[PDB]
Amino acid sequence: ESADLRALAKHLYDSYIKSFPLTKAKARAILTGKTTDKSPFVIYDMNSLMMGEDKIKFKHITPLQEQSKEVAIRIFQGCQFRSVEAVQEITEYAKSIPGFVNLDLNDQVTLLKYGVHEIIYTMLASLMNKDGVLISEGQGFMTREFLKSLRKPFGDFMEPKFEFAVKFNALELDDSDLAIFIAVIILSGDRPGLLNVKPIEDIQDNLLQALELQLKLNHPESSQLFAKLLQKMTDLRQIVTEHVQLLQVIKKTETDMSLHPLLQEIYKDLY
Ligand SMILES: Cc1oc(-c2ccccc2)nc1CCOc1ccc(C[C@@H]2SC(=O)NC2=O)c2sccc12
Numbered sequence: 001e002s003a004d005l006r007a008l009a010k011h012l013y014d015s016y017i018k019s020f021p022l023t024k025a026k027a028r029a030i031l032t033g034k035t036t037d038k039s040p041f042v043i044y045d046m047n048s049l050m051m052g053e054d055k056i057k058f059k060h061i062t063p064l065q066e067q068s069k070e071v072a073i074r075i076f077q078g079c080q081f082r083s084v085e086a087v088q089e090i091t092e093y094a095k096s097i098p099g100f101v102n103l104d105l106n107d108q109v110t111l112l113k114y115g116v117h118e119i120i121y122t123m124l125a126s127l128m129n130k131d132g133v134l135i136s137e138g139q140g141f142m143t144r145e146f147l148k149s150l151r152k153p154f155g156d157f158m159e160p161k162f163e164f165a166v167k168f169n170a171l172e173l174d175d176s177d178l179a180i181f182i183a184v185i186i187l188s189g190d191r192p193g194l195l196n197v198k199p200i201e202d203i204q205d206n207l208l209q210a211l212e213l214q215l216k217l218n219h220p221e222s223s224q225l226f227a228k229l230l231q232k233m234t235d236l237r238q239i240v241t242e243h244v245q246l247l248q249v250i251k252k253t254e255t256d257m258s259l260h261p262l263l264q265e266i267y268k269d270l271y
Protein backbone atom coordinates (compact mmCIF):
# COMPACT_ATOMS: atom_id res chain seq x y z
CA GLU A 1 0.00 0.00 0.00
CA SER A 2 1.16 3.53 -0.83
CA ALA A 3 0.98 4.79 2.77
CA ASP A 4 3.53 2.27 4.08
CA LEU A 5 5.80 3.06 1.11
CA ARG A 6 5.62 6.79 1.90
CA ALA A 7 6.41 6.19 5.58
CA LEU A 8 9.43 4.10 4.55
CA ALA A 9 10.63 6.88 2.25
CA LYS A 10 10.28 9.39 5.10
CA HIS A 11 11.99 7.09 7.60
CA LEU A 12 14.94 6.59 5.25
CA TYR A 13 15.18 10.33 4.57
CA ASP A 14 15.24 11.02 8.31
CA SER A 15 17.98 8.41 8.85
CA TYR A 16 20.01 9.80 5.96
CA ILE A 17 19.84 13.28 7.50
CA LYS A 18 21.01 11.91 10.86
CA SER A 19 23.81 9.87 9.25
CA PHE A 20 25.34 12.17 6.61
CA PRO A 21 26.37 15.66 7.79
CA LEU A 22 27.19 16.99 4.31
CA THR A 23 24.06 16.52 2.20
CA LYS A 24 23.60 17.27 -1.48
CA ALA A 25 21.47 20.29 -0.56
CA LYS A 26 24.28 21.82 1.50
CA ALA A 27 26.84 20.92 -1.15
CA ARG A 28 24.69 22.54 -3.85
CA ALA A 29 24.26 25.65 -1.68
CA ILE A 30 28.05 25.91 -1.34
CA LEU A 31 28.68 25.26 -5.04
CA THR A 32 26.25 28.02 -6.08
CA GLY A 33 28.23 31.05 -4.91
CA LYS A 34 25.18 33.29 -4.57
CA THR A 35 24.86 31.72 -1.09
CA THR A 36 27.97 33.52 0.21
CA ASP A 37 27.84 32.08 3.73
CA LYS A 38 31.56 31.90 2.95
CA SER A 39 33.39 30.78 -0.19
CA PRO A 40 35.64 27.75 -0.80
CA PHE A 41 39.29 28.30 -1.60
CA VAL A 42 39.90 27.28 -5.23
CA ILE A 43 42.79 24.89 -5.83
CA TYR A 44 44.08 24.57 -9.40
CA ASP A 45 47.88 24.04 -9.29
CA MET A 46 50.75 23.42 -6.89
CA ASN A 47 50.92 26.96 -5.48
CA SER A 48 47.18 27.05 -4.79
CA LEU A 49 47.26 23.57 -3.27
CA MET A 50 50.03 24.62 -0.89
CA MET A 51 48.15 27.83 -0.13
CA GLY A 52 44.91 25.91 0.44
CA GLU A 53 46.65 23.65 2.94
CA ASP A 54 47.43 26.82 4.91
CA LYS A 55 43.84 28.05 4.65
CA ILE A 56 41.90 24.76 5.06
CA LYS A 57 41.51 23.08 8.45
CA PHE A 58 42.16 19.36 8.02
CA LYS A 59 40.38 17.00 10.39
CA HIS A 60 42.37 13.81 9.66
CA ILE A 61 46.11 13.36 10.18
CA THR A 62 48.22 10.75 8.40
CA PRO A 63 50.91 8.99 10.48
CA LEU A 64 54.27 10.67 9.95
CA GLN A 65 55.68 7.56 8.28
CA GLU A 66 53.02 7.79 5.57
CA GLN A 67 53.25 11.51 4.88
CA SER A 68 54.51 12.39 1.41
CA LYS A 69 55.91 15.61 0.01
CA GLU A 70 54.28 14.74 -3.32
CA VAL A 71 51.11 16.58 -4.32
CA ALA A 72 49.37 13.60 -5.91
CA ILE A 73 49.86 11.43 -2.82
CA ARG A 74 48.56 14.07 -0.42
CA ILE A 75 45.47 14.43 -2.62
CA PHE A 76 45.08 10.64 -2.75
CA GLN A 77 45.18 10.60 1.06
CA GLY A 78 42.55 13.33 1.22
CA CYS A 79 40.29 11.07 -0.86
CA GLN A 80 40.94 8.02 1.35
CA PHE A 81 39.90 9.97 4.44
CA ARG A 82 36.62 10.97 2.80
CA SER A 83 36.00 7.25 2.30
CA VAL A 84 36.92 6.39 5.91
CA GLU A 85 34.33 8.95 7.11
CA ALA A 86 31.73 7.74 4.63
CA VAL A 87 32.10 4.06 5.51
CA GLN A 88 31.14 4.84 9.10
CA GLU A 89 28.28 7.11 8.04
CA ILE A 90 27.02 4.40 5.68
CA THR A 91 27.19 1.76 8.42
CA GLU A 92 25.09 3.90 10.77
CA TYR A 93 22.63 4.51 7.94
CA ALA A 94 22.44 0.79 7.07
CA LYS A 95 21.47 -0.22 10.61
CA SER A 96 18.32 1.90 10.23
CA ILE A 97 17.12 0.22 6.99
CA PRO A 98 14.22 -1.97 8.21
CA GLY A 99 15.24 -5.62 8.34
CA PHE A 100 18.97 -5.04 7.74
CA VAL A 101 20.00 -5.65 11.34
CA ASN A 102 17.96 -8.88 11.52
CA LEU A 103 20.04 -10.38 8.69
CA ASP A 104 22.83 -12.85 9.36
CA LEU A 105 25.83 -10.84 10.54
CA ASN A 106 28.08 -12.31 7.83
CA ASP A 107 25.63 -11.09 5.20
CA GLN A 108 25.48 -7.63 6.82
CA VAL A 109 29.28 -7.49 6.61
CA THR A 110 29.21 -8.58 2.95
CA LEU A 111 26.55 -6.04 1.99
CA LEU A 112 28.58 -3.18 3.51
CA LYS A 113 31.91 -4.40 2.14
CA TYR A 114 30.55 -4.41 -1.42
CA GLY A 115 28.12 -1.52 -1.08
CA VAL A 116 30.16 1.31 0.44
CA HIS A 117 32.18 2.27 -2.64
CA GLU A 118 29.13 2.37 -4.93
CA ILE A 119 27.54 4.70 -2.34
CA ILE A 120 30.73 6.73 -1.87
CA TYR A 121 30.84 7.47 -5.60
CA THR A 122 27.11 8.20 -5.68
CA MET A 123 27.46 10.88 -3.01
CA LEU A 124 30.81 12.08 -4.35
CA ALA A 125 28.76 13.25 -7.35
CA SER A 126 26.81 15.50 -4.96
CA LEU A 127 30.09 17.40 -4.37
CA MET A 128 31.07 17.72 -8.04
CA ASN A 129 30.20 19.77 -11.05
CA LYS A 130 31.79 19.77 -14.50
CA ASP A 131 34.54 22.14 -13.27
CA GLY A 132 35.65 20.54 -9.99
CA VAL A 133 34.84 19.07 -6.60
CA LEU A 134 34.36 20.33 -3.05
CA ILE A 135 36.98 19.10 -0.58
CA SER A 136 37.29 19.08 3.23
CA GLU A 137 33.58 19.59 3.95
CA GLY A 138 33.34 22.43 1.44
CA GLN A 139 36.26 24.53 2.64
CA GLY A 140 37.95 24.10 -0.73
CA PHE A 141 37.16 23.51 -4.38
CA MET A 142 39.67 21.54 -6.45
CA THR A 143 39.42 22.09 -10.21
CA ARG A 144 38.88 19.23 -12.63
CA GLU A 145 41.70 20.38 -14.92
CA PHE A 146 44.17 20.22 -12.02
CA LEU A 147 42.98 16.74 -11.07
CA LYS A 148 43.36 15.55 -14.68
CA SER A 149 46.99 16.71 -14.77
CA LEU A 150 48.36 14.45 -12.01
CA ARG A 151 51.15 12.00 -12.73
CA LYS A 152 51.51 8.18 -12.76
CA PRO A 153 47.72 7.38 -13.24
CA PHE A 154 46.06 9.77 -10.84
CA GLY A 155 44.44 11.31 -13.91
CA ASP A 156 42.81 7.90 -14.38
CA PHE A 157 41.85 8.09 -10.68
CA MET A 158 39.84 11.30 -10.97
CA GLU A 159 38.44 11.70 -14.46
CA PRO A 160 36.06 8.66 -14.57
CA LYS A 161 34.36 9.92 -11.39
CA PHE A 162 33.82 13.33 -12.99
CA GLU A 163 32.43 11.67 -16.15
CA PHE A 164 30.02 9.66 -14.00
CA ALA A 165 29.04 12.64 -11.88
CA VAL A 166 28.02 15.12 -14.59
CA LYS A 167 25.68 12.51 -16.10
CA PHE A 168 24.44 11.32 -12.69
CA ASN A 169 23.86 14.94 -11.66
CA ALA A 170 21.79 15.59 -14.82
CA LEU A 171 19.17 13.29 -13.24
CA GLU A 172 18.63 16.09 -10.64
CA LEU A 173 17.97 13.80 -7.68
CA ASP A 174 17.63 15.39 -4.26
CA ASP A 175 18.58 13.98 -0.86
CA SER A 176 15.15 12.42 -0.32
CA ASP A 177 15.62 10.51 -3.60
CA LEU A 178 19.20 9.52 -2.76
CA ALA A 179 18.25 8.18 0.67
CA ILE A 180 16.17 5.43 -0.94
CA PHE A 181 18.59 4.81 -3.81
CA ILE A 182 21.55 4.13 -1.52
CA ALA A 183 19.42 1.68 0.49
CA VAL A 184 18.66 -0.17 -2.78
CA ILE A 185 22.42 -0.37 -3.42
CA ILE A 186 23.16 -1.83 0.03
CA LEU A 187 20.43 -4.49 -0.20
CA SER A 188 21.93 -6.12 -3.32
CA GLY A 189 21.31 -9.87 -3.54
CA ASP A 190 24.13 -10.38 -6.04
CA ARG A 191 27.09 -9.58 -3.79
CA PRO A 192 29.71 -12.37 -3.71
CA GLY A 193 29.48 -14.79 -0.81
CA LEU A 194 26.00 -14.01 0.51
CA LEU A 195 24.49 -16.77 2.66
CA ASN A 196 20.71 -16.06 2.59
CA VAL A 197 19.85 -14.11 -0.55
CA LYS A 198 16.05 -14.34 -0.28
CA PRO A 199 15.64 -12.14 2.86
CA ILE A 200 17.87 -9.52 1.17
CA GLU A 201 15.85 -9.51 -2.08
CA ASP A 202 12.62 -9.25 -0.06
CA ILE A 203 13.83 -6.05 1.60
CA GLN A 204 15.13 -4.71 -1.73
CA ASP A 205 11.78 -5.39 -3.43
CA ASN A 206 10.13 -3.19 -0.81
CA LEU A 207 12.83 -0.51 -1.20
CA LEU A 208 12.45 -0.57 -5.00
CA GLN A 209 8.70 0.01 -4.66
CA ALA A 210 9.31 2.95 -2.34
CA LEU A 211 11.93 4.35 -4.74
CA GLU A 212 9.56 4.00 -7.69
CA LEU A 213 6.75 5.87 -5.89
CA GLN A 214 9.16 8.54 -4.59
CA LEU A 215 10.49 9.33 -8.07
CA LYS A 216 6.97 9.36 -9.51
CA LEU A 217 5.77 11.88 -6.91
CA ASN A 218 8.95 13.99 -6.73
CA HIS A 219 9.85 14.10 -10.47
CA PRO A 220 6.55 13.86 -12.37
CA GLU A 221 8.01 15.26 -15.63
CA SER A 222 11.15 13.09 -15.69
CA SER A 223 10.45 10.33 -18.20
CA GLN A 224 11.71 6.89 -17.15
CA LEU A 225 13.76 8.35 -14.26
CA PHE A 226 13.38 5.13 -12.25
CA ALA A 227 14.78 3.01 -15.09
CA LYS A 228 17.55 5.51 -15.84
CA LEU A 229 18.54 5.63 -12.17
CA LEU A 230 18.74 1.83 -11.83
CA GLN A 231 20.88 1.71 -14.97
CA LYS A 232 23.36 4.03 -13.20
CA MET A 233 24.08 1.12 -10.85
CA THR A 234 25.85 -0.46 -13.82
CA ASP A 235 28.03 2.63 -14.26
CA LEU A 236 28.76 2.67 -10.52
CA ARG A 237 29.86 -0.98 -10.56
CA GLN A 238 32.20 -0.24 -13.46
CA ILE A 239 33.79 2.69 -11.61
CA VAL A 240 34.46 0.44 -8.61
CA THR A 241 35.79 -2.57 -10.53
CA GLU A 242 38.03 -0.35 -12.67
CA HIS A 243 39.21 1.46 -9.53
CA VAL A 244 40.10 -1.88 -7.91
CA GLN A 245 42.15 -2.90 -10.97
CA LEU A 246 43.90 0.49 -11.04
CA LEU A 247 44.88 0.10 -7.38
CA GLN A 248 46.43 -3.29 -8.13
CA VAL A 249 48.63 -1.39 -10.62
CA ILE A 250 49.76 1.34 -8.20
CA LYS A 251 50.93 -1.36 -5.79
CA LYS A 252 53.46 -2.63 -8.35
CA THR A 253 54.73 0.88 -9.10
CA GLU A 254 55.07 1.56 -5.34
CA THR A 255 55.79 -1.34 -2.95
CA ASP A 256 55.90 0.97 0.09
CA MET A 257 52.61 2.72 -0.76
CA SER A 258 49.95 2.84 1.92
CA LEU A 259 46.19 2.60 2.09
CA HIS A 260 44.43 3.61 5.25
CA PRO A 261 43.87 0.42 7.32
CA LEU A 262 40.09 0.76 6.92
CA LEU A 263 40.42 0.77 3.14
CA GLN A 264 42.86 -2.16 3.34
CA GLU A 265 40.10 -4.18 5.03
CA ILE A 266 37.44 -3.11 2.50
CA TYR A 267 39.62 -3.87 -0.56
CA LYS A 268 40.86 -7.19 0.84
CA ASP A 269 39.38 -9.91 -1.40
CA LEU A 270 37.11 -7.32 -3.04
CA TYR A 271 36.60 -8.61 -6.59
C1 LIG B 1 44.61 7.85 10.93
C2 LIG B 1 45.36 7.04 9.88
O1 LIG B 1 45.54 7.40 8.60
C3 LIG B 1 46.25 6.43 8.01
C4 LIG B 1 46.63 6.45 6.68
C5 LIG B 1 46.05 7.40 5.84
C6 LIG B 1 46.41 7.46 4.51
C7 LIG B 1 47.35 6.57 4.01
C8 LIG B 1 47.93 5.63 4.85
C9 LIG B 1 47.57 5.57 6.18
N1 LIG B 1 46.52 5.48 8.89
C10 LIG B 1 45.99 5.82 10.05
C11 LIG B 1 46.05 5.03 11.35
C12 LIG B 1 47.41 5.15 12.04
O2 LIG B 1 47.61 6.48 12.40
C13 LIG B 1 48.69 6.74 13.26
C14 LIG B 1 49.43 5.70 13.80
C15 LIG B 1 50.50 5.97 14.65
C16 LIG B 1 50.84 7.29 14.95
C17 LIG B 1 52.00 7.64 15.89
C18 LIG B 1 53.43 7.45 15.26
S1 LIG B 1 53.60 8.28 13.69
C19 LIG B 1 54.03 7.20 12.67
O3 LIG B 1 54.30 7.38 11.53
N2 LIG B 1 54.05 5.81 13.39
C20 LIG B 1 53.67 6.03 15.02
O4 LIG B 1 53.59 5.19 15.84
C21 LIG B 1 50.09 8.34 14.41
S2 LIG B 1 50.20 10.07 14.55
C22 LIG B 1 48.86 10.44 13.52
C23 LIG B 1 48.37 9.22 13.09
C24 LIG B 1 49.04 8.08 13.58
Ligand SMILES: Cc1oc(-c2ccccc2)nc1CCOc1ccc(C[C@@H]2SC(=O)NC2=O)c2sccc12
Pocket residue numbers: 074075076078079080082083117120124133134135136142157158161263
Ligand atom coordinates in the same frame (compact mmCIF):
# COMPACT_ATOMS: atom_id res chain seq x y z
C1 LIG C 1 39.68 14.57 -5.02
C2 LIG C 1 39.75 15.11 -3.59
O1 LIG C 1 40.84 15.57 -2.97
C3 LIG C 1 40.47 15.94 -1.73
C4 LIG C 1 41.32 16.47 -0.78
C5 LIG C 1 42.58 16.89 -1.14
C6 LIG C 1 43.43 17.43 -0.19
C7 LIG C 1 43.02 17.54 1.13
C8 LIG C 1 41.75 17.12 1.49
C9 LIG C 1 40.90 16.58 0.54
N1 LIG C 1 39.18 15.71 -1.58
C10 LIG C 1 38.70 15.20 -2.70
C11 LIG C 1 37.27 14.79 -2.97
C12 LIG C 1 37.04 13.33 -2.62
O2 LIG C 1 37.12 12.58 -3.80
C13 LIG C 1 37.22 11.20 -3.59
C14 LIG C 1 36.82 10.64 -2.40
C15 LIG C 1 36.92 9.27 -2.21
C16 LIG C 1 37.43 8.45 -3.22
C17 LIG C 1 37.54 6.95 -3.03
C18 LIG C 1 38.68 6.55 -2.02
S1 LIG C 1 40.27 6.72 -2.78
C19 LIG C 1 40.78 5.28 -3.03
O3 LIG C 1 41.75 4.98 -3.64
N2 LIG C 1 39.82 4.28 -2.31
C20 LIG C 1 38.51 5.14 -1.68
O4 LIG C 1 37.60 4.67 -1.09
C21 LIG C 1 37.83 9.02 -4.43
S2 LIG C 1 38.49 8.35 -5.89
C22 LIG C 1 38.64 9.85 -6.74
C23 LIG C 1 38.17 10.82 -5.88
C24 LIG C 1 37.73 10.37 -4.62
Ligand SMILES: CCCCCCCCC(=O)O
Pocket residue numbers: 057058059060061062073074075077078081082136
Ligand atom coordinates in the same frame (compact mmCIF):
# COMPACT_ATOMS: atom_id res chain seq x y z
C1 LIG D 1 47.76 14.56 3.29
C2 LIG D 1 48.08 16.04 3.04
C3 LIG D 1 47.15 16.95 3.82
C4 LIG D 1 45.69 16.69 3.48
C5 LIG D 1 45.03 15.46 4.12
C6 LIG D 1 43.56 15.82 4.33
C7 LIG D 1 42.71 14.84 5.11
C8 LIG D 1 41.85 15.57 6.15
C9 LIG D 1 40.63 16.13 5.47
O1 LIG D 1 40.65 17.26 4.96
O2 LIG D 1 39.60 15.44 5.39
